[PDB]
């Protein structure tokens with residue numbers, strides 16, 4: 006289903022714990038090292054349930070995967086610890102996964118990006134990708150992101166990942182635009198309810214959706230202290246977030262800050278049924 | 281000294297002056313109970329309000345009694361009321377419900 | 381369906397217009413304010429005026445309270461029954477502070493149309509004003525809150 | 527007014543300064559380097575405070591300090607846990623001797639610091655028996671100044687924020703009125719707890735009578751952070767409401783001088799709008815309250 | 821010469837009032853009780869002036885002259 010792979014220490018399980026199991030960036034340092042493959046069955050959109058093959062990272066396991074379980078094993082999120090002394094190793098184990106994969110969607114994550122200094126982050130991601138894409142051609146076009154636990158770009162990672170397996174894009178984009186129309190918004194965003202990943206934009210900050218994913222994850226993770234789950238939040242009458250469907254939450258931003266609450270919430274509720 | 285007297289009375293006068301502000305704000309607030317039982321909103325007629333602004337009339341059947349004819353009254357009545365009703369019609373800018 | 385805010389603010393703002401009769405020397409002040417509110421809560425859905433937004437939202441809750449109290453009782457005056465296209469409703473005439481108010485339920489719906497005016501503005505006149513305005517809210521008849 | 531923030535060299539003076547005032551990510555304070563010359567972070571809000579770090583090197587009562595202490599509202603000495611604090615206490619008693627000598631009315635607050643990692647039991651264990659050795663070195667020095675104020679604080683937590691709140695609150699003159707005035711706001715409206723926060727600082731100027739369970743302070747602080755984080759994203763008064771499944775409401779409204787009222791509302795069953803409209807009405811008069819104290 | 825008008829419904833409140841009408845609203849009390857002929861008209865005088873009544877469709881127009 007979903008292959009979570011990469012050498013030891015690269016925080017595969019750390020990611021799994023954050024975006025899925027709702028660990029925070031801090032608590033994940035607790036996690037014991039993945040022994041063989043830890044499977045995780047969790048649903049997205051209700052309609053599709055996902056199986057997360059959180060593979061082992063240690064070389065013992067790694068070299069085993071391409072041996073007595075190669076057929077068994079064969080999307081692949083392959084992650085990369087930036088600091089690795091043995092870079093060309095990790096490149097070549099990626100190559101090892103690749104050939105067996107022709108036996109049978111590829112995503113590369115430069116994880117732990119929070120460690121390398123801000124200036125040589127751009128340059129360092131560039132050179133690494135220049136390589137991996139060339140290696141990947143044996144696929145023609147490779148898409149992969151810089152990824153850290155300590156920033157929001159982890160969410161933007163999996164957003165562009167999960168939506169790659171969502172068929173609703175044709176239906177939903179049509180069904181969301183048609184909500185933007187009536188509401189006279191600046192934009193509406195659709196997120197999944199539990200994971201908080203971006204599903205769809207309607208129509209001037211570029212890092213909106215990744216950040217919102219983060220801020221909202223943290224309000225919701227914070228809400229536990231009051232002992233109840235998040236439903237709605239209304240800001241300045243400008244910004245509206247509502248729980249909507251059983252497997253959807255919407256971030257609306259209105260153009261006028263005085264269209265009465267009960268109206269927006271009423272229109273939210275009528276639209277709520279559809280999707 | 282005497283300066284200390286004067287200033288000490290003041291500080292205490294300012295102190296009570298603050299107690300006033302507190303008490304006024306405290307007085308001014310509203311409860312949800314007050315909302316439920318409040319008799320601010322009551323049924324009203326114009327008869328009532330003029331009667332609280334704070335036998336009388338004798339009838340005449342004689343034909344000679346009227347200074348405006350029955351036909352004059354009829355025309356004024358129909359005129360006033362129709363002007364009111366016509367002036368009372370008001371149009372929606374568009375459909376109040378939308379599809380989707 | 382879902383409600384067109386712009387058109388509702390429009391209608392409500394058109395209802396603010398006063399009367400300038402010259403059958404006689406009769407003329408009214410403009411309607412002070414005018415809202416369509418929820419029948420369930422007494423929360424503003426749309427308003428027009430000739431923080432105050434709160435003062436209104438508040439008044440709404442007070443009026444809705446008395447309306448539902450009156451509306452749900454055993455038994456006869458400051459309440460006009462009205463028939464519109466076989467849809468039936470009640471117009472109520474209240475005094476609140478110094479104001480002349482006038483609330484009628486939009487038939488079959490969870491929406492009350494409520495007018496607020498000056499003391500100078502007579503009740504019997506507002507009754508007409510609201511009834512005649514009501515007759516143009518055909519789009520909303522039977523709107524149950526989502 | 528102003529406050530003296532002193533301690534045993536390299537113990538978390540500049541640390542809590544940067545994290546309280548600049549919302550610094552604390553591991554960036556790990557790489558902070560020794561300020562050897564007295565530095566002061568001003569703080570405005572309701573009172574116009576001024577926090578002055580002193581480098582420290584025992585007490586050494588200098589020539590200037592006689593007026594400086596006579597010019598101090600309150601004194602916050604920070605004792606680093608996880609180091610021999612007996613030297614800190616030996617020194618501390620000498621400082622409070624000078625303060626009390628010069629200005630007898632000084633409020634003395636002591637921060638038991640770097641307590642985050644240690645177990646709750648290890649903390650209780652430390653506190654009950656540090657208080658003892660603190661009053662010990664003072665019993666030897668004349669009478670006992672009733673300045674008993676031990677605030678167990680961790681920079682990596684909400685502990686400092688709560689402490690500093692209780693510290694600054696202790697200085698505010700109009701406080702007694704704020705509490706009772708704010709108190710019966712939350713009595714008329716359906717509010718279990720309300721705090722006046724400095725939005726930037728995250729410390730609180732006033733709360734109500736009912737118990738400040740730190741879980742709740744935490745919710746309100748985190749709420750502020752959320753509303754600001756979201757608001758800052760989109761710019762093309764300042765208020766924020768959120769409702770949870772159980773019906774409870776978190777409310778925030780901008781108020782005079784960088785403050786912001788943040789409150790938790792019980793539904794008790796009623797409509798949200800009714801609760802929100804009554805709230806807004808009361809909070810409007812409340813805003814008129816603290817507008818008419820300045 | 822007309823000195824004022826009141827025009828009221830049968831609930832008690834008023835539809836319009838000009839001249840003395842707006843002042844002497846109290847009259848609707850006694851006025852609404854007046855015995856009308858089969859045509860719906862009446863002439864009454866009670867206070868140094870003469871009121872004329874007409875009632876069409878539950879709406880009475882009262883107009884005012886003098887003695």
Ligand SMILES: Nc1nc2c(ncn2[C@@H]2O[C@H](COP(=O)(O)OP(=O)(O)NP(=O)(O)O)[C@@H](O)[C@H]2O)c(=O)[nH]1
Pocket residue numbers: 011012013014015016017018019020033034035036037038039040060061062063116117118119120152153154155
């Ligand atoms: N600074 C930083 N540390 C990270 C990040 N991701 C993970 N780590 C740290 O690195 C460790 C990686 O642990 P884990 O998630 O088990 O990695 P893994 O890829 O599952 N290894 P294995 O499969 O061998 O068990 C965690 O303890 C965590 O503290 C990141 O983005 N930034």
Ligand SMILES: Nc1nc2c(ncn2[C@@H]2O[C@H](COP(=O)(O)OP(=O)(O)NP(=O)(O)O)[C@@H](O)[C@H]2O)c(=O)[nH]1
Pocket residue numbers: 533534535536537538539540541542552555556557558559560561562580581582639640641642679680681682
């Ligand atoms: N665990 C923990 N570490 C802390 C805490 N406060 C500070 N530290 C760490 O301990 C060091 C000392 O803190 P710092 O504020 O720099 O000390 P200082 O009192 O300013 N030194 P100086 O007297 O030279 O001005 C810092 O590098 C910081 O990382 C705390 O509450 N908990």
Ligand SMILES: [Mg+2]
Pocket residue numbers: 018019036037038039040
């Ligand atoms: Mg692991």
Ligand SMILES: [Mg+2]
Pocket residue numbers: 539540541559560561
């Ligand atoms: Mg320092």
